Design an enzyme around this catalytic site. Sequence first.
Site, PDB file in Angstrom:
ATOM      1  N   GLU A   7       0.719  -0.933  -0.077  1.00  0.00           N
ATOM      2  CA  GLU A   7       0.009  -0.387   0.005  1.00  0.00           C
ATOM      3  C   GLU A   7       1.180   1.161  -0.043  1.00  0.00           C
ATOM      4  OE1 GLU A   7      -3.549  -2.085  -0.690  1.00  0.00           O
ATOM      5  OE2 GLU A   7      -3.261  -0.286  -0.413  1.00  0.00           O
ATOM      6  N   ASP A  29      -6.835   6.184  -5.467  1.00  0.00           N
ATOM      7  CA  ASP A  29      -6.240   5.046  -5.217  1.00  0.00           C
ATOM      8  C   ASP A  29      -5.911   4.595  -6.983  1.00  0.00           C
ATOM      9  OD1 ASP A  29      -8.793   2.934  -4.488  1.00  0.00           O
ATOM     10  OD2 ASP A  29      -7.816   5.096  -4.001  1.00  0.00           O
ATOM     11  N   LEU A  87      -9.138   3.897   2.661  1.00  0.00           N
ATOM     12  CA  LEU A  87     -10.050   4.315   0.949  1.00  0.00           C
ATOM     13  C   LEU A  87     -11.233   6.166   1.930  1.00  0.00           C
ATOM     14  CD1 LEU A  87     -11.048   5.167  -1.679  1.00  0.00           C
ATOM     15  CD2 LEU A  87     -12.992   3.021  -0.290  1.00  0.00           C
ATOM     16  N   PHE A 125      -8.499  -6.584   3.017  1.00  0.00           N
ATOM     17  CA  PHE A 125      -8.040  -4.822   2.984  1.00  0.00           C
ATOM     18  C   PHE A 125      -8.899  -4.584   2.275  1.00  0.00           C
ATOM     19  CE2 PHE A 125      -5.698  -2.100   5.639  1.00  0.00           C
ATOM     20  CZ  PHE A 125      -5.479  -1.049   4.770  1.00  0.00           C
ATOM     21  N   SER A 145     -11.456 -20.130  -6.617  1.00  0.00           N
ATOM     22  CA  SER A 145     -10.239 -20.088  -6.113  1.00  0.00           C
ATOM     23  C   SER A 145     -10.721 -19.782  -4.881  1.00  0.00           C
ATOM     24  CB  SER A 145      -9.638 -18.568  -5.705  1.00  0.00           C
ATOM     25  OG  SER A 145     -10.262 -17.402  -7.172  1.00  0.00           O
ATOM     26  N   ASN A 205      -6.639 -19.865 -10.940  1.00  0.00           N
ATOM     27  CA  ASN A 205      -8.220 -18.802 -11.382  1.00  0.00           C
ATOM     28  C   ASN A 205      -7.672 -17.818 -10.680  1.00  0.00           C
ATOM     29  OD1 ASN A 205     -10.702 -19.087  -9.434  1.00  0.00           O
ATOM     30  ND2 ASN A 205     -10.737 -20.061 -11.310  1.00  0.00           N
TER      31      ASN A 205
END
EC number: 3.2.1.17
Length: 164
Positions: free
Chosen positions: A11, A20, A32, A104, A117, A132
């Site tokens: 991040e 973003d 965010l 997250f 998955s 996948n």
Amino acid sequence: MNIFEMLRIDEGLRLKIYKDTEGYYTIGIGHLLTKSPSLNAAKSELDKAIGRNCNGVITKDEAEKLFNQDVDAAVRGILRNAKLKHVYDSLDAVRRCALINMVFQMGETGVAGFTNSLRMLQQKRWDEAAVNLAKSRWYNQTPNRAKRVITTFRTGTWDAYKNL
């Protein structure tokens, strides 16, 4: 390495409102603020989040505070989600970190949409599941990150982050 170190690699840290990869208003360590196009809406959310008048900028300290809340919420979200909790409980410590990272970035809802998955990870079919997960918007939009997360699920080690 732990969840916090891992996420802070993925991040980064920014002390000023920024957008973003998606163009959304964010600050700190991937927090965010709003999906809305006004910086003004974003500033308002920020002051709401911190409890002071920030004028668009926070201290390291505040960033870490938001980050601790966000990690806690991610884990809690996993635990409350039927789908999620089952896979989580089935995994080893390192892999559990990779599911936390996804949650997250993308939210509970988002990850719970990776039905196939999730099934494969539960079954411990690591290679299949890695193939996948790569078939997603997620991987196509943030390939270098998706691929670190993916190797993490595939190997169960921290190698993807050693580099970094």
